[PDB]
Design a protein around this ligand. Sequence first.
Ligand SMILES: CCCCS(=O)(=O)Nc1ccc2[nH]c(C#N)c(C)c2c1
Ligand SMILES: CCCCS(=O)(=O)Nc1ccc2[nH]c(C#N)c(C)c2c1
Ligand code: NA
Ligand code: NA
Lengths: 414, 414
Amino acid sequence: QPSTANGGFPSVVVTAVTATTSISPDIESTWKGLLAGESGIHALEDEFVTKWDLAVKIGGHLKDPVDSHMGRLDMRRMSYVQRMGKLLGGQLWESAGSPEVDPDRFAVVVGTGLGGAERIVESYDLMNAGGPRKVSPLAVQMIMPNGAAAVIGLQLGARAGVMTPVSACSSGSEAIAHAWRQIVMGDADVAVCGGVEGPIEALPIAAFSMMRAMSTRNDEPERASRPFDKDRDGFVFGEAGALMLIETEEHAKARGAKPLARLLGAGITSDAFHMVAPAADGVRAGRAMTRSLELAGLSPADIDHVNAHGTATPIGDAAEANAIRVAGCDQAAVYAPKSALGHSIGAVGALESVLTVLTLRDGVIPPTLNYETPDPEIDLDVVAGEPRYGDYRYAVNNSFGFGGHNVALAFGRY
Amino acid sequence: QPSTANGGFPSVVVTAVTATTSISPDIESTWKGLLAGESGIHALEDEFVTKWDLAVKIGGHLKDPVDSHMGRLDMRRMSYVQRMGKLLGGQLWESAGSPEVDPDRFAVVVGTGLGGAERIVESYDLMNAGGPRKVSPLAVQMIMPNGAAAVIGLQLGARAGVMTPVSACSSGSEAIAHAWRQIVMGDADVAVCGGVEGPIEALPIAAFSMMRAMSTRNDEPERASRPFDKDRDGFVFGEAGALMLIETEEHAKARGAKPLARLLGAGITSDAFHMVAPAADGVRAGRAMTRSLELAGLSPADIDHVNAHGTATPIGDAAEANAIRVAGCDQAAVYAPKSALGHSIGAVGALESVLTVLTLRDGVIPPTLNYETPDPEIDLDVVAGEPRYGDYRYAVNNSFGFGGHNVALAFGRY
Ligand SMILES: CCCCS(=O)(=O)Nc1ccc2[nH]c(C#N)c(C)c2c1
Ligand SMILES: CCCCS(=O)(=O)Nc1ccc2[nH]c(C#N)c(C)c2c1
Ligand code: NA
Ligand code: NA
């Protein structure tokens, strides 16, 4: 059975990362802020909060709005997630040294939770007011959920596949999983992968809050997201998009790229339990972690760090604690970055994969914010208080999306 | 290098198929109708055509509407594509003999072009009229594009992954590709895969017709879809959904399932050329065909049949003719089923994959309708007139989606 450890799969490395978050548009500045204990989560100042008297009045908008970088033309020819994708794609490529790769060995895999959905409403309104010829010839390419990945593949010249997985909260991690597959099956040597997602607005808040999925701790916004804490009361939105460049180790060495980490394996399973609730027993989610280890060639004792899905819902954190135990990883140092960055749905698995890479690169886990009275029924080694510097050799990033989609990514220190 | 032919990949077989089309709700009846020269494409009788005086007044609605099978509860708890998925999922499982499989070795991969998008508008309207608490607690799970795959995975108990690829016209074929990967990489032994898509409506017609992508031959609706014909003028919508059951040959043999065909390999490439136009040179699309042959262990001389993407746009059919030549497959007998069934976007690649299976099973290709004055600039062996009975050993199904997504699936006779 092939594994990364035994050479059955080629070695794959992470050579560049980019992200925009509620803390910073610069991933290295986001990382510094996380280590400093900063939160991106604040009182929402948008008019729509008071217009609807929303129960949720907190969240993290991007520190640097995407459209502050978008001129008239981009504002008219692309949906929001496409604009975010174009922005991050160009940033990532610059960070990688603008390499000249073989387009025929270059893939793009970018997940997203929904797609260009605001352009559906706009086209709907345009046609209602002016008839069918008032719909733009660009409407289809803006609306289609593959649109962000297509924009990035066209921008950077990727001709070895342009793929868009949709799996709610696990979309951005699943994209990295499929990019890894595209390389280890031999279809590509280099891939841009990750996830993008739209911004906080009234209808997204209404839809998730009517599930009772969201925190309503509006008086202390930075204290609201409390993964694994006894007093947690749901997730907080925190906007993001994130991409990484992965490539075979031989490809990286041949162009002088310095790896940040190794991407060793990916496990994809499903709960088949409930359309939005995770399975309480954590068994299939744990199996995704185990599968990523099988493909990497690691045992659970090797896993020093888990970057938790950790949304801070009551049932989600409990299920994940069971999952981590099921996978034999409950001695790992656990970080729940949604404590600081919130939940960005189709982007968040990619963002947390980038954070996992940085933890391995720098030998440090930032503190899980708001972990103050640990839930008596969960017993994980949650990093908290201040960053924990440690000898982290291998890590798993978890993302368990609504719908029952479990993705685990196994990374190693380079 | 592993191939199906040399044993590096396990043998994978197709053991059950289901589809709903503009000709019939019964795939075997659809097949009989195609062989009889029937078209599913008629004058649209919907009020929305006259309300907007749409330039396109033709298309194929499902012969048997999905919602004629949906009671009050399903109409309130699922989006349209989810209702179609539940319908086809249960039909497929019954056709397969309702097997008892290991949930932990059972995956679902279902592509779609857009998702539960009508529920976005509905939630939008509900909140505008009644505030945030009038949005349903079910809105998120109905809207999310992974929703149809999630419904099917929950219905049938698939715990080895539930995935949703989005790649416009190639979504349903890409789903079958990823299911094949999930099996040959060892993550699953059996998978339900295919694609679902929404119905014809005024806004979809307006959006694609403003690209000049659609036929306007309204006076002779069954004559409008003319792939590879000199007089073609764009595609016609024809509603569909389709699923197939695939599994390792050893799994099929162990439960007494009789294979309909072998699924031998899958190639995924991309054009990185234009957001909606295919590359004229057909090179990357041809490479998807070549890649499917490499993974199968076939040479182009083995390919007896190509089930063309064949949408009947001027530029699409020309590009595909170049693609087929680039791949060395231009001596294959070509069928363009959109001539009879129209284009169903995220479902159509799955539907045409089912048709490819039936061609191999039965040794017959139905006639490409409306192929009467072949385009002088395209020289393919298009089957036409009446069905061609022939010794078809291997076939490739092509799907080249808007965005530049190329998927080719290589199938073999069992
Ligand atoms: C972190 C927040 C997640 C919100 S989301 O999950 O609802 N996704 C999502 C996707 C595309 C979107 N386009 C637009 C516009 N205009 C919005 C508001 C928008 C929202
Ligand atoms: C063969 C036709 C393809 C049309 S589509 O590509 O526009 N897709 C698509 C997807 C979901 C949809 N939900 C609803 C509703 N109500 C519609 C009209 C609808 C349409
Ligand atoms: Na994580
Ligand atoms: Na086809």
